[PDB]
Tab-separated table of C-alpha atoms and ligand atoms in Angstrom:
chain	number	residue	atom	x	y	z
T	1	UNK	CA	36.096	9.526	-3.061
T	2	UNK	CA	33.308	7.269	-1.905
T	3	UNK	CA	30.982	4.373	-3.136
T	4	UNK	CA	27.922	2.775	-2.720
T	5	UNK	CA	28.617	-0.726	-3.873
T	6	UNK	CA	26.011	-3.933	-4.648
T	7	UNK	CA	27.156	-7.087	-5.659
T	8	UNK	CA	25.679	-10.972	-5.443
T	9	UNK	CA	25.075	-12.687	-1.925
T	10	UNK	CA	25.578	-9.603	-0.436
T	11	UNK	CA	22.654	-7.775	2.422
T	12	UNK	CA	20.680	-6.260	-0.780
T	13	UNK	CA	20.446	-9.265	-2.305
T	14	UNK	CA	19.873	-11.589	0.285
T	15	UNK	CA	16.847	-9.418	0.596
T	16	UNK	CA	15.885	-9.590	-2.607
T	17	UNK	CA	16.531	-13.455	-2.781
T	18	UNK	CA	14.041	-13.777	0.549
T	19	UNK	CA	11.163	-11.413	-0.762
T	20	UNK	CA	11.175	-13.954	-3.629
T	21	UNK	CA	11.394	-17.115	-1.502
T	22	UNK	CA	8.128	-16.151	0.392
T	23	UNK	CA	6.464	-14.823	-2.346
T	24	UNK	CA	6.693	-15.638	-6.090
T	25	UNK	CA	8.936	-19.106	-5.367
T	26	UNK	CA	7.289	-19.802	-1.968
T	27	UNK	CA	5.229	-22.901	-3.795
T	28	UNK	CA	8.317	-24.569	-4.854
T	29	UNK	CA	9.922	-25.822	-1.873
T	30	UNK	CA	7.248	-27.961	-0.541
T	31	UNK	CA	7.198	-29.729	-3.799
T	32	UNK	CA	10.629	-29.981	-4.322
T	33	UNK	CA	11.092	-31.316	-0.631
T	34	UNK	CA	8.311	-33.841	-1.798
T	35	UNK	CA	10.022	-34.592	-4.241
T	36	UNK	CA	13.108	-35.408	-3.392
T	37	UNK	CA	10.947	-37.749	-0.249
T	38	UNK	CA	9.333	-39.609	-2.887
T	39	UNK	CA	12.226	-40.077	-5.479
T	40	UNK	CA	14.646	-41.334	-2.544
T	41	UNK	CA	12.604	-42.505	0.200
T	42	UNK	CA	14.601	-41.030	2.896
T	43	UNK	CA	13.040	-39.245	5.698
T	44	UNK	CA	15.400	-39.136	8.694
T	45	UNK	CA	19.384	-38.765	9.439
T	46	UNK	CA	21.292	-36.083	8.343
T	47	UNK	CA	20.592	-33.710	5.584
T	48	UNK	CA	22.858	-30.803	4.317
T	49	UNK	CA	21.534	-27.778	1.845
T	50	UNK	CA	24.490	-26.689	0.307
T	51	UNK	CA	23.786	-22.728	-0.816
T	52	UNK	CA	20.688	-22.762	1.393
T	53	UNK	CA	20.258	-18.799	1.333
T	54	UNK	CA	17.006	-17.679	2.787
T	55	UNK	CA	16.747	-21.520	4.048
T	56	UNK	CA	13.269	-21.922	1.997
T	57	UNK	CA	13.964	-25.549	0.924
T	58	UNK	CA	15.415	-26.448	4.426
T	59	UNK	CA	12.540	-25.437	5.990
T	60	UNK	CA	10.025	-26.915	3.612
T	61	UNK	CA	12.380	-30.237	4.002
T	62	UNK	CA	12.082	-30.373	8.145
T	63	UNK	CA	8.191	-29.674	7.448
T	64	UNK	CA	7.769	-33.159	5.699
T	65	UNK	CA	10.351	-35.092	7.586
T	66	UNK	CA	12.304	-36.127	10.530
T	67	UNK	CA	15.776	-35.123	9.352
T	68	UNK	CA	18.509	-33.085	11.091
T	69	UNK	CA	19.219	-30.694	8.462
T	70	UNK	CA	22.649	-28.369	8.657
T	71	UNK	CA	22.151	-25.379	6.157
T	72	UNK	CA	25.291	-24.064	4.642
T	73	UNK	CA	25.723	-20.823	3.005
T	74	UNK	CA	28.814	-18.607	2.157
T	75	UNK	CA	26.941	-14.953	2.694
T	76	UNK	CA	26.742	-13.891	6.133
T	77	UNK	CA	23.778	-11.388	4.545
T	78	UNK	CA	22.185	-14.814	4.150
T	79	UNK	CA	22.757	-16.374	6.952
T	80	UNK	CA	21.181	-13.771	8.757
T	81	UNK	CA	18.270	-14.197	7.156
T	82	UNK	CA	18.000	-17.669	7.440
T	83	UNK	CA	18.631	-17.384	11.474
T	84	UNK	CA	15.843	-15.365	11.309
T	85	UNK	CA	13.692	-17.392	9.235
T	86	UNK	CA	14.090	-21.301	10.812
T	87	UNK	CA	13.279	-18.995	13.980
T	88	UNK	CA	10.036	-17.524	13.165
T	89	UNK	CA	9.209	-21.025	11.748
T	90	UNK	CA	10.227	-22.273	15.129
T	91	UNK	CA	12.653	-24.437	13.719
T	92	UNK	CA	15.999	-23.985	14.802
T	93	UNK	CA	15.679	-27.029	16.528
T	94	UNK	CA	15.688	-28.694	13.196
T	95	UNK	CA	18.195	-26.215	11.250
T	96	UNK	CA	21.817	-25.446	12.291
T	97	UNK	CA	23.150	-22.583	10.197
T	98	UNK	CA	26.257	-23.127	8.778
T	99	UNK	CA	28.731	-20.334	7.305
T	100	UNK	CA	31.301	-21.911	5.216
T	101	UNK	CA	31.788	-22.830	1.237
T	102	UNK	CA	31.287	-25.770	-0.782
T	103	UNK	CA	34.737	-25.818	-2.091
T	104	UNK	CA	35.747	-26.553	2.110
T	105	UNK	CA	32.355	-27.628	3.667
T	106	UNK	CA	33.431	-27.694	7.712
T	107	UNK	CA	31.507	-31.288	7.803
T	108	UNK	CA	33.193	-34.562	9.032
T	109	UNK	CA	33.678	-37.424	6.134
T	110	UNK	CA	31.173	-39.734	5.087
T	111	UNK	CA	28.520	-37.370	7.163
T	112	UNK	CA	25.188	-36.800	5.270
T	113	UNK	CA	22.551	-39.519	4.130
T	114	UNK	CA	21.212	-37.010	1.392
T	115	UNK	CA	22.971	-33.619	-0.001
T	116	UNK	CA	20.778	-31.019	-1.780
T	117	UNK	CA	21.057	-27.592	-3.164
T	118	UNK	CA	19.169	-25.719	-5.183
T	119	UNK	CA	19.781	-22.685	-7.370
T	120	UNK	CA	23.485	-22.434	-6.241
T	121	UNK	CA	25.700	-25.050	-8.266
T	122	UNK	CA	25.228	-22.969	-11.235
T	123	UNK	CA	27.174	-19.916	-9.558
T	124	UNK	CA	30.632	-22.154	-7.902
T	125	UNK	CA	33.904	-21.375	-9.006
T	126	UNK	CA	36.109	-24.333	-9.256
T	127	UNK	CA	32.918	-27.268	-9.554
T	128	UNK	CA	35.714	-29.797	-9.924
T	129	UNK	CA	36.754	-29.083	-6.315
T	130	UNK	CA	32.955	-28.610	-5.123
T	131	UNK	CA	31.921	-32.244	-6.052
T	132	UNK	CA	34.740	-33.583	-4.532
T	133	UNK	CA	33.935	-32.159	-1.522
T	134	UNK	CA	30.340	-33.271	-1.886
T	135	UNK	CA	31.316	-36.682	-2.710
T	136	UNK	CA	33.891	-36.509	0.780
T	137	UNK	CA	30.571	-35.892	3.134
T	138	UNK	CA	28.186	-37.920	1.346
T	139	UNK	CA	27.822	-41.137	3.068
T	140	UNK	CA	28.332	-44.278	1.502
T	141	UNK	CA	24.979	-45.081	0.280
T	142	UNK	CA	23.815	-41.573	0.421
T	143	UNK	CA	22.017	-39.413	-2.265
T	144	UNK	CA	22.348	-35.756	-4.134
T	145	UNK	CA	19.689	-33.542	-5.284
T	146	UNK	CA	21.534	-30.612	-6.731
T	147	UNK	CA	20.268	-28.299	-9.401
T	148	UNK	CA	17.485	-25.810	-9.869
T	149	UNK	CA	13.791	-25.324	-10.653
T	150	UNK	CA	10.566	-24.966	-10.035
T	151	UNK	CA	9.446	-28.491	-9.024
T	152	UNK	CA	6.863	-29.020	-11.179
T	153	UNK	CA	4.855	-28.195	-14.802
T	154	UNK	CA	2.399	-25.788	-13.461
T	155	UNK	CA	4.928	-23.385	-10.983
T	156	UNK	CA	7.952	-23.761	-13.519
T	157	UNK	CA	5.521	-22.071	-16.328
T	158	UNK	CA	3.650	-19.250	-13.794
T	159	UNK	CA	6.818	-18.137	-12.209
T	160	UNK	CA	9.028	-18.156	-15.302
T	161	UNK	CA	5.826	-15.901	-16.851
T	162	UNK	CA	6.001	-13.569	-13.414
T	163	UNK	CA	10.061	-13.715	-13.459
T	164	UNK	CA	10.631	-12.270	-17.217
T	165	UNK	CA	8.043	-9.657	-16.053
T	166	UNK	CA	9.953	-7.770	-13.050
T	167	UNK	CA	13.651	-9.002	-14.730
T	168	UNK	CA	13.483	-9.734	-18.455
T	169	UNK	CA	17.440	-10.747	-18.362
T	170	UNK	CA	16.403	-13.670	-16.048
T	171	UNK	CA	14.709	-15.724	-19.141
T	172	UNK	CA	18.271	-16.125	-20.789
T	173	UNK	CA	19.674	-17.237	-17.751
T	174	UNK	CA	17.479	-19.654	-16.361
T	175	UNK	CA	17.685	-21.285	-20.307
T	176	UNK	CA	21.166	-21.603	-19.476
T	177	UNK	CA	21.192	-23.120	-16.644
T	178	UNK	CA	17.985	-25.915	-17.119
T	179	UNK	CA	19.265	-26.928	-19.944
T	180	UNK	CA	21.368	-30.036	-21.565
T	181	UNK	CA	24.786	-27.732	-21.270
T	182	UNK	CA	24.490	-28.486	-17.594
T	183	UNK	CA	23.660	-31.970	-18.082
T	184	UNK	CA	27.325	-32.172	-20.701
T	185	UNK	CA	28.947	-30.037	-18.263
T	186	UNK	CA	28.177	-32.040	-14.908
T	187	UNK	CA	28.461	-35.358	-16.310
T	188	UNK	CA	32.239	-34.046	-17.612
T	189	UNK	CA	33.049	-33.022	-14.071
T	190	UNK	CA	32.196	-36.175	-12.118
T	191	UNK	CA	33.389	-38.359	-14.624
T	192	UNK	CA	37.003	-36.976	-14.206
T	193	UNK	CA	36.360	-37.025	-10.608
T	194	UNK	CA	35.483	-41.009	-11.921
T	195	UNK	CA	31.931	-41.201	-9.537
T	196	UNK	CA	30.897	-45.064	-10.487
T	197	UNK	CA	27.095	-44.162	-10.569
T	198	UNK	CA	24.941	-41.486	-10.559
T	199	UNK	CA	22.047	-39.694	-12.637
T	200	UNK	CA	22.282	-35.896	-14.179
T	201	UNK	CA	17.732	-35.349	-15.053
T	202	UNK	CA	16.468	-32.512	-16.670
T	203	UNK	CA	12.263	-32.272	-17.060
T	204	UNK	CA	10.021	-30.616	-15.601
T	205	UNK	CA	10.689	-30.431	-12.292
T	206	UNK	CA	14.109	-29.010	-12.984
T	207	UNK	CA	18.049	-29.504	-13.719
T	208	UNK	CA	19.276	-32.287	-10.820
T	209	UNK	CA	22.268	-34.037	-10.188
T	210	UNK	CA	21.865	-37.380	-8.203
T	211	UNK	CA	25.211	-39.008	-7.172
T	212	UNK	CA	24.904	-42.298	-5.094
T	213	UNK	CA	28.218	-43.446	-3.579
T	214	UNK	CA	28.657	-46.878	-3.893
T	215	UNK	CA	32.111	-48.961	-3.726
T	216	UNK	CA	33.499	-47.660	-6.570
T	217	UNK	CA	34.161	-50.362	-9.897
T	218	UNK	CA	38.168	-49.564	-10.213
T	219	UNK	CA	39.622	-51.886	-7.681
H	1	SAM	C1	19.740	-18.297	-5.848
H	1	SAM	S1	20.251	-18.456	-4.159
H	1	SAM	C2	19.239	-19.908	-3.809
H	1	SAM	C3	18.872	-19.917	-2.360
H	1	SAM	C4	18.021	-21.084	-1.897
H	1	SAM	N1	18.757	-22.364	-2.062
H	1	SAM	C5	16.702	-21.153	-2.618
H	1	SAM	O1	16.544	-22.011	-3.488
H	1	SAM	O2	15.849	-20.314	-2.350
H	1	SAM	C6	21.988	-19.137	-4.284
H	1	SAM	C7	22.811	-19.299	-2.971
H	1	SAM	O3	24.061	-20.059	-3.042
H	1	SAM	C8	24.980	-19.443	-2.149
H	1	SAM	N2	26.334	-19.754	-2.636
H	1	SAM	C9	26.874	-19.381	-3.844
H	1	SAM	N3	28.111	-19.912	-3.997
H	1	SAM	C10	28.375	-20.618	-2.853
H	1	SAM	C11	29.487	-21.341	-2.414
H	1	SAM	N4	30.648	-21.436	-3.087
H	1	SAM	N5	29.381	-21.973	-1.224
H	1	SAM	C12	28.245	-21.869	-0.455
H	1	SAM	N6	27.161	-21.123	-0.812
H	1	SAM	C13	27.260	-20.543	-2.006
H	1	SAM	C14	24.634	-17.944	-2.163
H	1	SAM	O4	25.208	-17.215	-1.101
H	1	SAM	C15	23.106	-17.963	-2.243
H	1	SAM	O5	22.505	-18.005	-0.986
């Protein structure tokens, strides 16, 4: 017997996810990066993109500011992609590619001055294990942007429109996952991790979860 197989991450679908990313979603990242400048103020040191894919938001992040971004993805089919992409942008100089998982990121402790993802957290396994891994490379003072969306108002409600048009299944999902569940479901996995401050937003620009580490109040 034979097969023909298809299943998430894999080359078919880290083709699909890039057709997407420079088409229908291409608007998003450079007001997401903006975003997350404005809402934190930091424009240089280290930034990871934890389930980076195609490497849309990484590239729309090194666009707007000075950081050295490392983009790390699980798929291979993505990272291949991405190579390709940062390249073409002529921006591999800004973007390292990174193949490894958030449950075991291959980064040093206490590493990144802000950690963002988008569209990912809503797919890990084992999220108990992810944030504690995100927690171990964030550097003391550093911030979190992870979550999904559109950014803003305007491209949430013209993509969403364009989305439930080519897959109609996609409206559930996304209701899912921008939604107060997350926000009940995150804030129950870092407090038993016991993360002393952070912020879990949902509006318009998206689901987002914003841990700060700080010296932690139990001592
Ligand atoms: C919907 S895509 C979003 C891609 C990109 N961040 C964007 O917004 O265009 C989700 C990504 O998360 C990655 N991913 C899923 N689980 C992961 C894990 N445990 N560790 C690292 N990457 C993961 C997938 O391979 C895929 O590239």
């Amino acid at each position: 017997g034979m097969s023909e197989n298809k299943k998430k991450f894999d080359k078919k679908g880290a083709k699909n996810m890039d057709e997407i990313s420079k088409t229908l979603f291409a608007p998003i990242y450079p007001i997401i990066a903006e975003n997350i400048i404005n809402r934190f103020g930091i424009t240089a040191g280290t930034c990871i993109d934890i389930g980076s894919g195609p490497g849309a938001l990484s590239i729309a992040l090194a666009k707007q500011s000075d950081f050295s971004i490392r983009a790390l993805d699980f798929s291979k089919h993505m990272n291949e992609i991405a190579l390709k992409n940062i390249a073409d942008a002529n921006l591999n100089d800004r973007i390292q590619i990174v193949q490894g998982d958030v449950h075991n990121i291959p980064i040093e402790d206490n590493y990144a001055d802000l950690i963002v993802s988008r569209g990912s957290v809503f797919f890990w396994e084992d999220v108990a294990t992810a944030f504690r891994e995100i927690y171990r490379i964030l550097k003391s003072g550093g911030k979190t942007y992870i979550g999904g969306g559109f950014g803003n108002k305007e491209l949430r409600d013209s993509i969403s429109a364009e989305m439930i048009r080519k897959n109609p299944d996609w409206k559930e999902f996304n209701r899912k996952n921008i939604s107060q569940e997350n926000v009940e479901r995150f804030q129950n996995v870092l407090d038993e991790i016991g993360i002393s401050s952070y912020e879990i937003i949902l509006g318009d620009e998206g689901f987002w979860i914003i841990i700060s580490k700080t010296d932690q109040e139990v001592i």
